[PDB]
Design an enzyme around this catalytic site. Sequence first.
Site, PDB file in Angstrom:
ATOM      1  N   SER A 141      44.341  40.023  38.225  1.00 23.57           N
ATOM      2  CA  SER A 141      42.910  40.540  38.306  1.00 23.57           C
ATOM      3  C   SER A 141      41.779  38.857  37.605  1.00 23.57           C
ATOM      4  CB  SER A 141      42.427  41.864  37.544  1.00 23.57           C
ATOM      5  OG  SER A 141      40.684  41.633  38.426  1.00 23.57           O
ATOM      6  N   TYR A 183      42.350  47.117  30.306  1.00 20.35           N
ATOM      7  CA  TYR A 183      42.957  46.406  32.254  1.00 20.35           C
ATOM      8  C   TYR A 183      42.778  44.967  32.287  1.00 20.35           C
ATOM      9  CZ  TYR A 183      43.120  45.886  36.556  1.00 20.35           C
ATOM     10  OH  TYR A 183      43.182  45.540  38.802  1.00 20.35           O
ATOM     11  N   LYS A 229      46.338  42.891  32.063  1.00 17.19           N
ATOM     12  CA  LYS A 229      46.494  42.050  33.415  1.00 17.19           C
ATOM     13  C   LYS A 229      46.338  40.084  32.747  1.00 17.19           C
ATOM     14  CE  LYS A 229      46.439  43.959  37.239  1.00 17.19           C
ATOM     15  NZ  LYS A 229      47.871  44.045  37.941  1.00 17.19           N
TER      16      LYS A 229
END
Lengths: 238, 242, 234, 235
Positions: C139, C152, C156
């Site tokens: 991301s 997150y 990532k």
Amino acid sequence: SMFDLTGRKALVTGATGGLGEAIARALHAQGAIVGLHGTREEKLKELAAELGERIFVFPANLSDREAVKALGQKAEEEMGGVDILVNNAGITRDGLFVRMSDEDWDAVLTVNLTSVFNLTRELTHPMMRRRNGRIINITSIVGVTGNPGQANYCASKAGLIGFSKSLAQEIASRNVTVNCIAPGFIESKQKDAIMGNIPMKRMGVGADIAAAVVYLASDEAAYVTGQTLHVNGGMAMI
Amino acid sequence: PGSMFDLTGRKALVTGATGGLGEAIARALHAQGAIVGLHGTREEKLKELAAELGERIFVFPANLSDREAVKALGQKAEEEMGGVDILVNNAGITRDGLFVRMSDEDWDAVLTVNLTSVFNLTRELTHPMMRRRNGRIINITSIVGVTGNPGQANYCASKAGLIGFSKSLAQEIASRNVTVNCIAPGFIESNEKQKDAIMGNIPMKRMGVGADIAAAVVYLASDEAAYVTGQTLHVNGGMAMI
Amino acid sequence: MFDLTGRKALVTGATGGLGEAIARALHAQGAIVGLHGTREEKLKELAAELGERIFVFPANLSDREAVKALGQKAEEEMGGVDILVNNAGITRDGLFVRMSDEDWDAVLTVNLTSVFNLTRELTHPMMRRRNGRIINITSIVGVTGNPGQANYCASKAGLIGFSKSLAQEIASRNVTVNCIAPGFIEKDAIMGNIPMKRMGVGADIAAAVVYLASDEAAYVTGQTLHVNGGMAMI
Amino acid sequence: SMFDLTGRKALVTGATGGLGEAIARALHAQGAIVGLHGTREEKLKELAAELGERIFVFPANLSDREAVKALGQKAEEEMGGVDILVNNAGITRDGLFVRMSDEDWDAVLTVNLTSVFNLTRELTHPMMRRRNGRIINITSIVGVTGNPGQANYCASKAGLIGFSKSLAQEIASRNVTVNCIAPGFIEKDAIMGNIPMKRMGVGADIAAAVVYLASDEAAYVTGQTLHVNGGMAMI
């Protein structure tokens, strides 16, 4: 003490500007002998007087290639060897790229990149001969993020980083480091828009950059070279 | 106080403080007037370092594999030091080897200690810092988190993750004057074919020393670095240039 | 050019926006596509539609033994996976100060450790074949950071670090490992930061997967392809 | 089909060199109408002959500012609008920084950055008017890593990227994308030792990346740097 620059000779370009002045103050505060470059000797002499001892003043038009060379030679001569070069002088000729004249491009690239090349070339071999040096290039957040209206400035400031990395690789084994500092938005609708992208929600101040200069200039940062130190309140995170 | 990069009366917790980097970090922070929490696993070696530095030192043994011990660590440090101003997440482990040979345990161990234990330790101290409207979280990552390195899929994941964690956190807590930053050491002195080959990749042609990292820690911990957050400071002799 | 005829592709999270677009592009380029997901009905739907050259592999990516079984199943049944697209990812969004062990653990487990395991299942086979493509959907946020996403972001960012390390290990085996970093894919607060002033669509990411999967990107490894409308510029 | 460039007009600078030829061939194979730039007409006419159709030949001295401007105007004119600009021509003036002349510095900065700025300026407004465009700049791994002996080259190539990002931000809403490809080492053991893939890149490795960025499928990709380097540097 730590990050002590006592006896170190530093040349700071664009020293009358907000950042240049702050940088010159921090180095001076750390015991450095500081050469102030600017265009107007009168204003430099005032800063020199306000700072006190251990100051040299070196006016030069950085768009004049021969004056850039003479500047390096003069600072090197009068300071008795420059140990720390802070390439802080930069210009902008902002504007949309499609309206961007050759002169707006050329002027920014000449001052922001080519003058840095030349000033740095004056001082680099001297520093390597002394087996100690710091070249500290003030780039911008915008050299790594990009910024619209700034194709010239962004190219120059990104170029400055690339230049720095190459030079760093070349002279590292001779104990001269070369590093960049990338200021975000520094106090010198529009404001709120910029502020919205700053996690810290305050403008930077000269002293934010100046401390990063002292850090990089220090003996303690001898193992740091080819780097870009982002001082930007989290506006861009690398 | 008020001198440049002065950390007088600042409370710092340093994990892996008996190690190469950890010790150098603790010494530099201590030299800068900081009150230093020395974390390690071997309580003895901790007490011994505590005795060398003498005053303004706490010893905090903890197993960073043990999530509950990590939580206890942060709470104990927060209590006994009267609030932690500076967290240096330095402790890390490797379980090196080719990915094709890399067990679940080798992966899990490295990620839990290097990333998850960091998340937990940091979670213990972050709100306290924010309430104080002052904090420094300084995460020791690795060049290898940015470059990749064969034999270290797990370590690189953990160190790259540490950076992404730091950037997210920096963004959340920046308005509370708590900064979070990483230092990426290159190769730091801790056979002649191996050392020769690594050195060929270091423009400076020497190994780093703990003090190189420790000084970067002092800089980021300083009030002067209040406008630095979410960043990674590469201290690597030019081995990778970002 | 960028022909993937007869290439075996396994796409995790293939029922979601990105996963589905990726599967479609890969299939359109001649690939035999293994569709991973949890929703067996949505899998059957996409499979029935795409028709030929589809396999369906349901798996709970939180279940470690299931991840390994997935890799083994796809390898065995597809007759050798040439392209692994690690696309399946979860969030447990929330401010870090309120972030539970479980919210952290779950995100790192699925987004990072499950990728570790699936990839490990398929790596030696790809290396044995001296051909492979591991394409990891990370991301923008793994590079920029994002408030609300300490877990997150870590996963990532960590996915990229893993990929570089793996890429260097296995590059001589003609197995490339690359990441694609979508920006915002289908708040004017978000689009204010996107120079292009539109959202990404799945097909934007799908095309990037086809590019990286291609024989033509054989010299691309350890990289992160940002497909984000200019939202972050690396 | 995917990554089809049929009816796209591309201008490729340094189209007779290794990379330039490979780029122009890949663009041509994908259906693009390719304008071939170079310094010598003989070389250009040769390449044009073998490619056959959908080719233009535009010789120009890129160190000549007015030639650069003329190049852009001529290409935009004769091709009926340039959709894809591949700034690929670049020079080196390698040497130790302490020995680096103003001439070595200036020449590299002028050709590698300034001529790109002017060529790009000639074609950007048109593309923005059409609400479609691809500016694809060939930088170098070395613009990101640094490299000794190339202070000038690295400054130029790093500056190229920064230029690209700024321009990308400016013109993105007009759906003109601007991106960089950073080739690693394209077809010594010291160099090879730092390439995980243990081979040099070929022109085609770069051309394919150009095809990808030039494609409609890459319409959401802007301000980026695509590293094609056998893993030599991983960003």
